[PDB]
């Protein structure tokens, strides 16, 4: 059954709640982004209105085959009226098409649902500016001070320089990047751009990227693996066995594999800066784990919440254990006491 933190009180709206059958009283289902945990349940048989970004709408229609009559894409940063309620979609700085949702309840209550997001000071100059928010449904994925990682800029700079140096030293090296889902596309796009190559990938992954409204994708992606020296593979294949098997299939065109595993936070980030990251190596294969996060760090999350000054916070991640809930409520009170709201 649909949990409480996916319900918007005072409306007939749910958020990322497609795996609970027909939710009681839901006139419109909002989808924050196209990640499996959040769209779980949608298919060509869904017969209720889905509200989402245009990019998420492209993915629902092409990847899940949802009928167009049930897809309601909304522009970003635009006050829209949905079933008599004013709503705004804001960029969540997560994966392509990911949004936060502002709900203007009829009784005057204002609710911000972040979906999944990586907080950034640029959000302090969105439509949230000088907007009273009474309730915040917060992506609390990394809501603990030990969760530190670099900016996406620094990680991409490390990936670009690492890939460019390796391929310049060995023109016969292949660069491989692992992928879970949508998101973190900048990793393989920036590597291919510095190497003068297109990104080769499966037809299914190619189809997914064609839905993302990225300007000039036909410039950087392709399904012709032989024409590419930057290949996309499923994240599970980014291991020594999986990469050895892939290299045998390249027809003797390459004698070395440089592989990147885009991860979230890992325990290595407690001791190792991005500049000092080193790979796992076995023979002619090296694997880099790079902390490219599309979720807020603790400090980014704290800064955003202390700026927004919500009257109530409802976590949407790490809600399953009393220890996590107690830990998160303690930090919420700390932020409130320090900031003074
Ligand atoms: O949509 C999303 N789903 C999920 C699901 N499981 C996860 C497990 C671990 C970490 Cl670090 C991130 C996760 C995640 N992040 C997303 O953005
Ligand atoms: Ni997500």
Swiss-Prot record:
Top-level taxon in the UniProt lineage: Eukaryota
Effect of residue 295 to A: Impaired nuclear focus formation, reduced interaction with PIAS and increased sensitivity to cisplatin
Subcellular location: Nucleus
Induction note: During mitosis. The mRNA encoding this protein contains an internal ribosome entry site (IRES) in its 5'-UTR. This 5'-UTR generally suppresses translation while specifically promoting expression during mitosis, when cap-dependent translation may be impaired.
Record-annotated disulphide pairs: none
Tissue expression pattern: Expressed in brain, heart, kidney, liver, pancreas, placenta and skeletal muscle.
Subunit: Binds constitutively to TP53BP1. Binds CDC27, which is itself a component of the anaphase promoting complex (APC). Binds PIAS1.
Similarity comment text for this entry: Belongs to the DNA repair metallo-beta-lactamase (DRMBL) family.
Role noted for this protein: May be required for DNA interstrand cross-link repair. Also required for checkpoint mediated cell cycle arrest in early prophase in response to mitotic spindle poisons. Possesses beta-lactamase activity, catalyzing the hydrolysis of penicillin G and nitrocefin. Exhibits no activity towards other beta-lactam antibiotic classes including cephalosporins (cefotaxime) and carbapenems (imipenem).
Protein's recorded name: DNA cross-link repair 1A protein
């Amino acid at each position: 059954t649909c949990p409480f933190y996916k319900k918007i009180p005072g409306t007939g709206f749910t958020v990322d709640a497609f795996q609970y059958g027909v939710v009681e009283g839901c006139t419109a289902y909002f989808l924050t982004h196209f990640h499996s945990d959040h769209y779980a349940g949608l298919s060509k048989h869904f017969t209720f209105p889905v509200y989402c970004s245009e990019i998420t709408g492209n993915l629902l229609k092409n990847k899940l085959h949802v009928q167009e009559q049930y897809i309601h894409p909304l522009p970003l940063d635009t006050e829209c009226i949905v079933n008599g309620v004013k709503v705004v979609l804001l960029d969540a700085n997560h994966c392509p098409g990911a949004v936060m949702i502002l709900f203007y309840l009829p009784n005057g209550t204002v609710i911000l649902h972040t979906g999944d997001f990586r907080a950034d000071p640029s959000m302090e100059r969105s439509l949230l500016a000088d907007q009273k928010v009474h309730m915040l449904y917060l992506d609390t994925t990394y809501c603990s001070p030990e969760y530190t990682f670099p900016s996406q800029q620094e990680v991409i700079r490390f990936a670009i320089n690492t890939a460019f140096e390796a391929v310049t030293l060995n023109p016969h090296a292949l660069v491989v990047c692992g992928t879970y889902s949508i998101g973190k596309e900048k990793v393989f796009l920036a590597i291919a751009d510095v190497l003068g190559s297109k990104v080769g990938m499966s037809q299914e992954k190619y189809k997914t990227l064609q839905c993302l409204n990225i300007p000039e994708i036909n410039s950087l992606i392709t399904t012709d693996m032989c024409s590419s020296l930057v290949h996309l593979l499923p994240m599970m294949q980014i291991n020594f066995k999986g990469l050895q098997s892939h290299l045998k299939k390249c027809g003797g065109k390459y004698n070395q594999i440089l592989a990147f595993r885009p991860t979230g936070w890992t325990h290595s980030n407690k001791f190792t800066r991005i500049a000092d990251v080193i790979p796992q190596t076995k023979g002619n294969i090296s694997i880099y784990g790079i902390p490219y996060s599309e979720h807020s760090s603790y400090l980014e999350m704290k800064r955003f919440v202390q700026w927004l000054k919500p009257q109530k916070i409802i976590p949407t991640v790490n809600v399953g254990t009393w220890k996590s809930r107690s830990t998160m409520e303690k930090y919420f009170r700390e932020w409130k006491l320090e900031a003074g709201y």
